[PDB]
């Protein structure tokens, strides 16, 4: 369901 | 600056339920 | 929101997505006052019977979405947070009472197109437009209905509703800190935040200044769009000395 988010943002 | 929407008031454009709330005050 | 329409793109350029790191999800919704705080529900970080606890690093907002499940990749923003503040006498033991946050962004944000903080009202502000029968608008990513997730921001108008009805539709204590908003069973309309919808914005377009307020949070209902219930929303007014006292206390 959700996209993947760029990993920074983790 | 706060309230101001860049894409409506900013430009002068208005959305297109904004009316309805206005018409209710 | 049950019963909205799409929002326009950049109609709403203070709604903030509150967002879980891991599992990936929606928490819930949320608004941008300045360039480095977020206003939300309290119930949104703590709610200790669902055992719901919150911390700033379980936590992402992203704000200049559009798409409530894809990534915008150069419209929207993502940011990290430094610090939560709850109102220290939010009642979640009994009803919600006071259901009010701040969220200190870790970095100040950029406005653009599509994200711009929303006001705050003033004594005379909330005065004239907080009454019984005047509109406010609310948005959000939540269900659609009570009993699906929508693709794109929902938007609803709402009546503000006498206090006496909010009070006889529910068996709950109503404090001064709660409005309820929403169409009677006779009036032939409906709409309704729900789940997920939570913490975001009521906001008012003051005729006078021509700008957008923060009038309510929403708080809690009965259902979603049930016949003869409403929804109830934190009155940001009254609870604003509170939220200038922590922006200044450490700010801001
Ligand atoms: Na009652
Ligand atoms: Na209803």
């Not at chain 3, 790191?21 to 999800?25: I, L, N, R, T």
């Given at each position: 369901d959700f996209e993947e988010i760029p990993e920074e943002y983790l | 600056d706060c309230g101001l929407r860049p894409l409506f008031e900013k430009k002068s454009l208005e959305d297109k339920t904004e009316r309805e709330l206005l018409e209710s005050y | 929101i049950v019963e909205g329409s799409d929002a326009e793109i950049g109609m709403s350029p203070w709604q903030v997505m509150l967002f879980r790191?891991?599992?990936?999800?929606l928490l819930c919704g949320a608004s941008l006052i300045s360039d480095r705080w977020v206003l939300t529900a309290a119930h949104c970080l703590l709610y200790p019977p669902w055992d719901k606890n919150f911390t700033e690093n379980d936590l992402l907002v992203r704000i200049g979405?559009?798409?409530?499940?894809?990534?915008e990749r150069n419209i929207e923003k993502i940011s990290m947070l430094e610090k939560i503040y709850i109102?220290?006498?939010?009642?979640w033991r009994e009803?919600?009472?006071?259901?009010i946050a701040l969220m200190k962004l870790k970095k100040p944000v950029a406005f653009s197109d599509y994200i711009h903080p929303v006001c705050l009202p003033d004594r005379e502000t909330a005065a004239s437009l907080l009454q019984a029968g005047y509109k406010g608008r609310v948005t959000g990513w939540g269900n659609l209905k009570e009993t699906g997730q929508p693709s794109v921001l929902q938007v609803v108008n709402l009546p503000i509703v006498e206090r006496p009805v909010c009070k006889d539709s529910t068996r709950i204590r109503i404090t001064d800190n709660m409005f309820c908003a929403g169409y009677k069973p006779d009036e032939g309309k409906r709409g309704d935040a729900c789940e997920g919808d939570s913490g975001g914005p009521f906001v008012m377009k003051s005729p006078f200044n021509n700008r957008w307020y923060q009038?309510?949070?929403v708080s809690w209902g009965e259902?979603?769009?049930?016949?003869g219930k409403y929804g109830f929303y934190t009155h940001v007014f009254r609870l604003k000395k509170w939220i200038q006292k922590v922006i200044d206390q450490f700010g801001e």
């Open positions: - | - | 790191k891991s599992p990936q999800e979405k559009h798409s409530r499940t894809r990534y109102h220290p006498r939010y009642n009803n919600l009472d006071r259901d009038m309510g949070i259902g979603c769009d049930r016949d």
